[PDB]
Fold selenosubtilisin.
Amino acid sequence: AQTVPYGIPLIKADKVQAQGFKGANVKVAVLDTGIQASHPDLNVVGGASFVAGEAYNTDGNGHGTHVAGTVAALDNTTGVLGVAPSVSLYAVKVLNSSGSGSYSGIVSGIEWATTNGMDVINMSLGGASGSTAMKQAVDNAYARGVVVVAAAGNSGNSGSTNTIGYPAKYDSVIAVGAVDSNSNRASFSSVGAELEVMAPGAGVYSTYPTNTYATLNGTXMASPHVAGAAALILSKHPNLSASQVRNRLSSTATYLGSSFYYGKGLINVEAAAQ
Ligand SMILES: [Ca+2]
Ligand SMILES: [Ca+2]
């Protein structure tokens, strides 16, 4: 029997999936530690590794397989259900088993995904600094029509300190914060002027290496929900631009409070797909 995580109904993705739009023919690339491709509730159609020694179809850490399950775990009678269970899923391995990569590795992942025509890029990762080539790669991606989503960061609120990290801090990247099952800001969610929307990030249940399932906490769990919401909108309205997908998501968000803490608010993909 399949479990539906609380996140899928809280962002109303089940409402859109019942209308018949499940993400078919949208290509989503997960830039992360890889994906365990043999996992029975995941279908990975391809990908690339910029980690020497490792292929994309292995996840030595866990983080990548979890983030992918939240975007695309298959709608069946097994494990969990993703936000866009019919997308074409691509694994781009830019982080190692330890969950560390260099800026160049990440940049070659972004570049590979823009060049292989992904509709949506998810980066559940954040550095303390940017990089000129990283700014150019996401600006490039977004100018080519790719929706670019990343985790705002898990640095919490500190007075009026802007704690949003990179690539989220760039203007061509949707910075995603974290709420819990009661729609409260998760204490670790970064704050700052660039925070755009919030999604489920506390206690998220999803696929995990080796044919199992796990609960993790992070804006890194919040981000795949928005990458999945974009995929649903695009399988329903397939000639929209990336700024049109981006604009449906923040203009229809449910207001939760001050933008420093919440951005435009909690996404509602039913309202955004209308
Ligand atoms: Ca399933
Ligand atoms: Ca941004």
